Structure formats: C-alpha cells, structure tokens
C-alpha cells in the first residue's frame, strides 16, 4: 500500500553518484571557478550544492556556506565574494532535496594576492 512516494533509486544511486572534481581554478582574488564531472548523472538529482570556506584566514572554520546551483546541467559553479591572499576548501557534491550525496575530494584553492590581467 503505497500511499506516495518519490525518488526510489534516490537512495541508491544518490550516493553511488561519484563526482571527480579536478581542481578550483582561481581565476581571481575575489572570485573561483569550481569545476566537476560524473560519470552517472542522476535523473532524480535536483541540482549541487558547492560549499566553500576559509581555512587560513579568520572567518576559517568559522561557518561554512553553500552555494544551489539550482541547475542539474551546470557541473561548474563560481564562488564569489572571496577574500584575496587566502587558502579555501570546496568541494562538490550532488543533492536531491535536502540529503547529498557523497562530497567530493575536498580541494583548497589559495587565492594570490595581486590580480593578474583580467578580461570579462
């Protein structure tokens, strides 16, 4: 008697989901593009969910944030709002409603110190 339900694989699949994530590339001191792959998509996934922190600075391990792609097409995201000459751990991990699949290798991005020639 099943009343209602939704996601039956989510459970399965959801954590199985194995997101690569090469590396955060600092394009600026104020801003870090987020790069990842899978190599199964899940149907069911609503999106990803990018959590970002400092680790060297003062707000490190102070309080983590999260950033909703809202767009399960969009395996890259870009974290803004960064503070300059600072390491910062992100890692990707998938998300239906509000479980997440197994996070990604958590990879720290040290964002220099004088901007470099910027164009965009």
Known sequence: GS?????????????????????????TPTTVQVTWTVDR?????????????????LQAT???????????????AVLVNLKKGVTYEIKVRPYFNEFQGMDSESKT????????????
């Open 3 to 27: 009343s209602g339900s939704s996601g039956r694989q989510v459970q399965k699949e959801l954590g199985d989901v194995l997101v690569r994530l090469h590396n955060p590339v600092v394009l």
């Open 62 to 76: 102070s309080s983590w944030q999260n950033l909703d792609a809202k767009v399960p097409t969009e395996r890259s």
């Open 109 to 120: 991005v040290r964002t220099t110190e004088e901007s470099g020639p910027s164009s965009g």
């Open 41 to 57: 998509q899940p149907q069911f996934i609503q999106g990803y969910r990018v959590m970002y922190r400092q680790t060297s600075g």
